[PDB]
Design a protein around this ligand. Structure first.
Ligand code: HEM
Ligand code: HEM
Lengths: 458, 458
């Protein structure tokens, strides 16, 4: 029977909008979901969305016959620099299906065999950095993880070295990307967007868009001008034809794809690695199990592709980190036609839903009462997990195209870290989660004592 | 560096085979392992296996990239009546993966909420039996535990009442199941099984298979006709679809699954309860601690699901019984590819291993020197145990699908026993372990004096 959904506290004519005027909006929404349950309405001037937290409702939301990907206000703002790349395109735009069909084979599990050597190149740089620290020094974890994941997508994707391990201050492209992302996210919480105060932000936004476009357009133009057949994502985009339309991507869409991949590789996989290491140092029996596996499996001076596929327990660790802190924590959907959600909530065509992934992943009816505990063993027998219960990579045809890339990279790197070092939570670090496009453990530091195991050449 | 492995005494061209021509083969193999150490070769005419006893080697055997489940000769003979049910199927058989995907969510810890009431039905029957004994009487422990466990899987699994507490002699189906298993196990010694001497054995075997098939097929046929929904394992099997293939199980395979569950829920699961109660009566301070927990937690006339989940020390007692006398004490593996075990023992593709679980569980490098002592406190934090050190339910994707079911049932029943009765080892019983498919403390008897605490309705 039909039910009225709950709604969090309001602010007069601003409705719920000021609830997002916080540097930690997803975390605020999680606390609201804890108070209100599996569904709540969230209203702002001119817009309504419904936040879903239960597997029961989210499984219905994931029915692609009833619901399609929506661009949230955040993604609409990100679209000012990521364009109609795969992440910020509507499913019905021609460039979505074109790019999807062209790029899917380049992101497959099979494709990882070809990226593996370049992934190892950057992972060796990380391990060497940490081998070279002095006794009294420590590691800035999200910082080094971001250096690694950005450089890996730059190299594997476009044969471009950001050389982030040679820098304190980020590459200029990244300065502009990060500042562009910050502006996109800050705009969400402004009650008066056109206020004269925000004039200067808008000028900086246009300058950062120009830095990004200029470097990426030059990368593309340089590759076209050289003729080089590097066999990377850029080569595949320049030469590939969509089997369905027979058309290639144009150079402007290629730029948007490249921007999109650099955003992804800076923002998400780095957070996964950071959270994984956080949980490992907070759960030393789990760390022991992962380290024992790394030692047993990674028998050669550098890891092979086959060896990375052998690291089951490291995979379980990564999935359990994705469970607790999925680093792209929300995705949006719209109702394709009028429909009733969960037998109880009537929706009209066009109505928006938000899937709160960290809450889905804390659904006690699925996972049990111990949802805050870090237990990789939850994933030991993967078929035990119900359908649509675990969605850190989104849903259906609009799921993360980078999933195999992220998993392979993270498994490789975490395996190598655990083979080469013991870790100490020397500050007894208190988890503090910063929110940008994604989630990361801000200020997370550790000490790493080398096991003094030689590392092979690249 | 490459070692030759030890081998127990041989009998000319019969090799090691006569060592298993004994009433207690697992216990013989344990003694061989004490003599020979972590690995030994066992040869019979036409075959070889290697028995493993250390965590150091078993952790490698449990690497699913390197080794998969093998059907031992015993499981090949059980397959004559358990078919391609989950326990007697190869991982590469379509019906293994289909049934695995369909059934696993119905055996989860969360699924136990739905079975709990039916489990209580049978547990109340056990408690009422014991409340109704006269002062001069005693309890035949494995016999009553088997009545409980069989009836619980019958009721929870397919809404069938064996009514074992209304009988002295087994239900006709069970007579046939036990005699089929006996025949399967006896066939392990027979040199020329096509000898006319065994014609009656073959006739009896076919008759026993017919008894089991007729009942189970009728159960299935009766349910399909009615359209009755019971939320039980049969309902799930009739309606469920494998997410991967999109196919349901066929009726023949469902029958094999039901036969398989009945085998499992008989003495394999009742052995846990029997050994647990044995160890409790032999360790009165442990019994007292467990009884104190039961009294503190089980404050209502019948136990709730949540209350059973609070019986931590009862669960520790059960784990410690599984440590010493795991009731499915060995499992078989085969090498997927050529590989070296432990840096020392080269194996070829197809080579077989046997994991001797009771010996694994006595590895002093893992458990310390006191491995024969019954100390439930070893399990205060099960996360402290290394990977592949405590394996009473097997390994990985071929682990026991019934683990949560068995543990929940055993915790519930043992908690109620400890709430309702004091126990006396009135005969000072000498442990005598009978071997079939499983292990049982044969002849174990106790007296139970009622605490005279009322029991609720079902
Ligand atoms: C742990 C790491 C990652 C996580 C958790 C993650 C998560 C997600 C999620 C949840 C979506 C769906 C978004 C929505 O529905 O609005 C998505 C889409 C996407 N991700 Fe990722 N991602 C990760 C890594 C990557 C990487 C490494 C790349 C590329 C190199 C990438 C590229 C994309 C793209 C292109 C899409 C859009 C796909 C489409 O709609 O066609 N991601 N990701
Ligand atoms: C204390 C009780 C039990 C113990 C110690 C036990 C132990 C085991 C072990 C060691 C295996 C792996 C066998 C191998 O690798 O060859 C296994 C498999 C299995 N067990 Fe159990 N079990 C118990 C209770 C149950 C119950 C109650 C059920 C069902 C009602 C069940 C159903 C199964 C099934 C279907 C498999 C095959 C799983 C697969 O390969 O997909 N077991 N059990």
């Amino acid at each position: 029977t039909i039910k009225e959904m709950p709604q969090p506290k309001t602010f007069g004519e601003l409705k719920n909008l000021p609830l997002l005027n916080t540097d930690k909006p997803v975390q605020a929404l999680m606390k609201i979901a804890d108070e209100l349950g599996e569904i709540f309405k969230f209203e702002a001037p001119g817009r309504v969305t419904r936040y879903l937290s239960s597997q029961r409702l989210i499984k219905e939301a994931c029915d692609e016959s009833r619901f399609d990907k929506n661009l949230s206000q955040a993604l609409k703002f990100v679209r000012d620099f990521a364009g109609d790349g795969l992440f910020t395109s509507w499913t019905h735009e021609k460039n979505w299906k074109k790019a999807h069909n062209i790029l899917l084979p380049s992101f497959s599990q099979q494709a990882m065999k070809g990226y593996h050597a370049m992934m190892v190149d950057i992972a060796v740089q990380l391990v060497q950095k940490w081998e070279r620290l002095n006794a009294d020094e420590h590691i800035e974890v999200p910082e080094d993880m971001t250096r690694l994941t950005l450089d890996t997508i730059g190299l594997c994707g476009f044969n471009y070295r950001f050389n982030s391990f040679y820098r304190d201050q980020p590459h200029p492209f990244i300065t502009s990307m990060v500042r562009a992302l910050d502006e996109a996210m800050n705009k969400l919480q402004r009650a008066n967007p056109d206020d004269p105060a925000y004039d200067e932000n808008k000028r900086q936004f246009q300058e950062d868009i120009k830095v990004m476009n200029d470097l990426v357009d030059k990368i593309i133009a340089d590759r076209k001008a050289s003729g080089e057949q590097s066999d990377d994502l850029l080569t595949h985009m320049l030469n590939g034809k969509d089997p369905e339309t027979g058309e290639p991507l144009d150079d402007e869409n290629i730029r948007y794809q490249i921007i999109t991949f650099l955003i992804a590789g800076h923002e998400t996989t780095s957070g996964l690695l950071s959270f994984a290491l956080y949980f490992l140092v907070k759960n030393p029996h789990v760390l022991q199990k992962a380290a024992e596996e790394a030692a047993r499996v990674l028998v050669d001076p550098v890891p092979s592709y086959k060896q990375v596929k052998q690291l089951k327990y490291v995979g379980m660790v990564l999935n359990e980190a994705l469970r607790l802190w999925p680093t792209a924590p929300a995705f949006s959907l719209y109702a394709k036609e009028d429909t009733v959600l969960g037998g109880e909530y009537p929706l009209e065509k066009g109505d928006e839903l938000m899937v709160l992934i960290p809450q889905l992943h804390r659904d006690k009816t699925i996972w049990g009462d111990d949802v805050e505990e870090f237990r990789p063993e939850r994933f030991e027998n993967p078929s035990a997990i119900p359908q649509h219960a675990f969605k850190p990579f989104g849903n259906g045809q609009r799921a993360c195209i980078g999933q195999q890339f992220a998993c392979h990279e993270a498994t490789l790197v975490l395996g190598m870290m655990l083979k080469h070092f013991d870790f100490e939570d020397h500050t007894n670090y208190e988890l503090d989660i910063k929110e940008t496009l994604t989630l990361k453990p801000e200020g997370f530091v550790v000490k790493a004592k080398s096991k003094k195991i030689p590392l092979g050449g690249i």
